[PDB]
Amino acid sequence: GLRVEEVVGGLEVPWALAFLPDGGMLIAERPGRIRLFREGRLSTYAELSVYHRGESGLLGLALHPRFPQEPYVYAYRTVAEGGLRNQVVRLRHLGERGVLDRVVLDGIPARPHGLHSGGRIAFGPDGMLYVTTGEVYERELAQDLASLGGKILRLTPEGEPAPGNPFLGRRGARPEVYSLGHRNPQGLAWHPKTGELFSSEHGPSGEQGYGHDEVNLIVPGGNYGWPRVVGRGNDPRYRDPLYFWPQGFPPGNLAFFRGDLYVAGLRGQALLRLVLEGERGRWRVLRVETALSGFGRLREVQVGPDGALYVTTSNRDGRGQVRPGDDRVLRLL
Template sequence: MVSRRRVLLGLLGLSLVRAQGIRVEEVVGGLEVPWALAFLPDGSFLVSERPGRILWVQGGRASLYAELPVYHRGESGLLGLALHPQFPREPYLYAYRTVEEGGLRNQVVRLRHQGNRGVLDRVVLDGIPARSHGLHSGGRLAFGPDGMLYVTTGEVYERELAQDLSSLGGKVLRITPEGKPAPGNPFLNRSGARPEIYSYGHRNPQGLAWHPRTGELFASEHGPSGEQGFGYDEVNLIVPGGNYGWPRVVGRGDDPRYRDPLHFWPEGFPPGNLAFWRRDLYVAGLRGQALLRLVLDGDKGHWRVARVETALSGFGRLREVQVGPDGALYVTTSNRDGRGQVRPNDDKVLRLR
């Protein structure tokens, strides 16, 4: 159990907790299903709320930055955020959302930063599968070290979409900031394949992180929840053109046609995002309600998980984890998403030092 010592300093004040040598501060509370963070150069940050709002948090206080129409049901709505890597010279924020007008689908949109507001600029990528149940929409956005935008998409509970190269569902996509297929993508010249695809065979990938030294891409992914057993949530090392097996393989298949996960939880640990911090890989847990530290051993292309430790618990469901410009680790709770126990002042953004 995590020892807890709270000092509440007003509605949006600080809450101090010590957990296994980590100091935890509550930066802001009273949020509604926060999904992703995007840090501005001055250390303030934007946070998406799944019902369709983006808030700007400065000095522990949140103000409305943008509000977008979304289809908010199940796991869908306003999800990932990513700031252009050349911001503010390129004054753009990217967002992943589910929309209903003109046909239900997921899309990546771009907002222009104007003073203290974000204004919808254009649709960058459209036609990502979505379904009325709102499940398995993927939704993570992140710019890689190559300056390209990576997008995770789910297979919307239609399992074969993950293996279908003509569909954007069940994939990790790689596009330019303008929404074009990125140069060097593995299926650029394959007839019938979507050129935006970077990897495939994914059920519902939820997180992206690059190794700070080798530049390799790691992703977190939800395993089955009844359609092919339960559990087997994964962390994968993503390679261009890799097939990660869903729905042909659950967990480790030892089949050369498919990429085995770097690590998986047979009993289940549905992940949110993941991030490298102080040489280790941290994975946020939703149903697992903990932040795990994965200690890696090896080197480029040959990693193994040496051990797994609980770094933080006691805050309920955790979704976002990201390193801020101050070197601290930021984590969001997701207790108001209909699947958690709501705690006082939920949902929250926490800062770990």
């Protein structure tokens, strides 16, 4: 049994967390504010102009692998100035505040409705920047190697296509693409033992079928089926998910904690624990258990430097029930 304790509340859709080496904590609020929680006080680290409609705005957040030597905080945001699109930007760290440094990758698909913008970013064991993107409700983008939408991208911290990427030599293909065939993926997590990448993504919603949200084991160049395939199939061209909920469980981020894979649930309003059995390249879920419930919609989930599991609530994202002090950062054990 995991014990919960509230770290801080009153936040508006805390999409991602970043743990500063000195103990502080950066919190990305979808409306466009990056908050700093330190010594029991909440302050504004930075304010960024964003397009906050639908599921868009200020989404993923990640510190440079060599932070603070390389004083840089990365953020994924939907912007409208000069044209509506998603992008990954970088801010220069000044201690208690951050200021826009430059755009790292621009032109990721976005639409006026603000739906399916993806947004999860994180630096992997290889030191590269991984970025999830949605197909903005134009499902065919996911299968289009020429589109940055419905993909998982991999870049160097400077924004260049990562060396060794799967489509580096092909004409008509975006060299930034790591994997394709993804609807709206928002999770990124690496298995501590194998280094394998796992991702979570929302399945169809009266959008070609209901439920079938999933957790995928991401391999370089892998095509995860959307929109050609929903759930599992017999087609070897498209990789089946490690697990999927035929009755839908729309997922937030996911993280490895104590040998198990935890998945934050948004509509399901719960934190699920996936018990795995297998080895590199051969995993399967033995059983699924509820690790947390009674706190509403859950979106971000990360293991902190203290070894504790941090989770954020999403009750104020327009699809939940807002209650006093809502949208907290919770610490489990």
